């Protein structure tokens, strides 16, 4: 009903804008490709000490030093 | 699918049906004034439904076979007995008046249901709003007692405030001498006994309590007899009446829905006319009551529910 939508735009633009922004707020998170990083950054932020684990030889993937190649990497955030 | 919240949700809205001539028009006047002819012509010309004045047999004619029933079933009252002995001792006067008010309330419920369901207006001769003139004339002439008047007022207070008033009221003013002359000309052996004081009391009530009150909320049209004749003029007045008054303006779909639900259950409509106020004029007594009730339930087409009487031709009972 483009005629009705139009009359609404002419007489009551405020409500038309309100509903348009409502819809855009609902939609944009789904469409956007950056929505994945919103939670990844929050996970990356370290608010608590990373307690080390006791080595036992069955831990080939968890690094031993902060500057080791292994472990999670934040270069994706460094160049976002 | 009886009307209900489900039907209202799925459609069947009153405001949708209402049109220009979806009104309630009430014709009033003293005895023998032309109400019947005026109402019939107004209804025929405007397309509305005519409702002949509710009488002692309105309920019986509207329910069951449609035939009138014995007076023991239809109220144990008699207009002829009222006119012959107005100051009886069995309270025929007040019994008749209360029965007539109950019949008028039932007819008003029927009319409102018709209007709300179909949107077609209704033309009624007198109504529960103007019924009290006869009671006031009775009390003024001494035919009834203050207790009877109090009981009538209580039932009216319990029942009347629940329904919308008529859109338009049309009062045919004819003076008492002409009322008397018309009664004599008609020649009813019992009606002719009416005293002129009783008619004057009816006119006094109509002109003192009714018209000023109804002017507050409805559209009132007062005519003399020479204008009541030629009903086309009355219809021409109604056709240009502008309704900008009364409780009909503040109604909406979800007020018409509840009014319709009230008016659709005739049992609920008459619930309060039967309050247990033990007025001797109206109290029956267990023995006579049970006798009459059993005799009534033994009438054809009354033993069971309407769709379940094999004696009157009802069929498929075992699957209903």
């Amino acid at each position: 009903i483009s005629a009705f939508l139009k009359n609404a735009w002419a007489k009551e633009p405020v409500l038309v804008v309100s509903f348009s922004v409502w819809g855009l707020a609902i939609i944009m998170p789904m469409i956007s490709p950056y929505t994945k990083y919103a939670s990844m950054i929050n996970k990356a932020t370290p608010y608590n000490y990373p307690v080390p684990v006791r080595d036992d030889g069955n831990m080939p993937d968890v690094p031993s030093h902060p500057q080791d190649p292994l472990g999670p990497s934040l270069d994706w955030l460094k160049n976002l | 699918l009886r009307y209900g919240l489900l039907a209202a949700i799925l459609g069947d809205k009153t405001t949708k049906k209402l049109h220009e001539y979806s009104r309630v028009i009430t014709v009033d006047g003293n005895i023998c004034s032309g109400k019947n002819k005026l109402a019939k012509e107004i209804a025929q010309q405007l397309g509305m439904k005519h409702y002949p004045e509710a009488g002692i047999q309105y309920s019986s004619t509207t329910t069951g076979d449609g035939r009138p029933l014995d007076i023991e079933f239809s109220g144990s009252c008699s207009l002829e007995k009222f006119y012959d002995d107005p100051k009886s001792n069995d309270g025929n006067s007040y019994r008749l008046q209360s029965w007539l008010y109950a019949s008028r309330l039932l007819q008003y419920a029927d009319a409102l249901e018709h209007l709300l369901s179909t949107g077609q207006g209704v033309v009624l001769e007198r109504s529960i709003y103007s019924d009290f003139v006869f009671l006031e004339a009775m009390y003024n002439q001494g035919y009834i007692r203050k207790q009877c008047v109090d009981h009538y007022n209580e039932i009216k207070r319990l029942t009347l405030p629940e329904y919308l008033p008529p859109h338009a009221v049309i009062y045919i003013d004819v003076p008492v001498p002409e009322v008397q002359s018309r009664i004599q000309k008609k020649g009813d052996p019992h009606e002719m006994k009416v005293t002129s004081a009783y008619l004057q009391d009816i006119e006094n009530a109509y002109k003192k309590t009714f018209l000023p009150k109804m002017s507050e909320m409805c559209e009132v049209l007062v005519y003399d007899s020479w204008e009541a004749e030629d009903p086309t003029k009355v219809v021409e007045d109604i056709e240009y009446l502008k309704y900008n008054k009364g409780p009909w303006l503040k109604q909406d779909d979800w007020t018409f829905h509840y009014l319709r639900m009230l008016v659709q259950d005739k049992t609920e409509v008459l619930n309060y006319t039967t309050i247990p106020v033990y007025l001797p004029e109206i109290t029956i007594g267990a023995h006579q009551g049970s006798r009459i009730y059993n005799s009534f339930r033994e009438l054809p087409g009354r033993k069971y529910a309407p769709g379940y009487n094999a004696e009157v031709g009802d069929k498929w009972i075992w699957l209903k």
Partner: protein, 48 residues
């Protein structure tokens, strides 16, 4: 023909009648099947 206002229950609600009869038949069939299956399971569990 008799009632001025045609009775509200002039004819059977055929949908209601059919559904009620079908529901009763289904209830009985399911009940018998359940009883037979329960007896079989009970005997199998208890070794006849």
């Amino acid at each position: 023909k008799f009632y001025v206002r045609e009775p509200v229950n002039a004819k059977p609600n055929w949908l209601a009648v059919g559904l009620s009869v079908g529901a009763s038949v289904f209830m009985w069939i399911y009940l018998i099947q359940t009883h037979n299956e329960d007896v079989l399971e009970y005997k199998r569990r208890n070794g006849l």
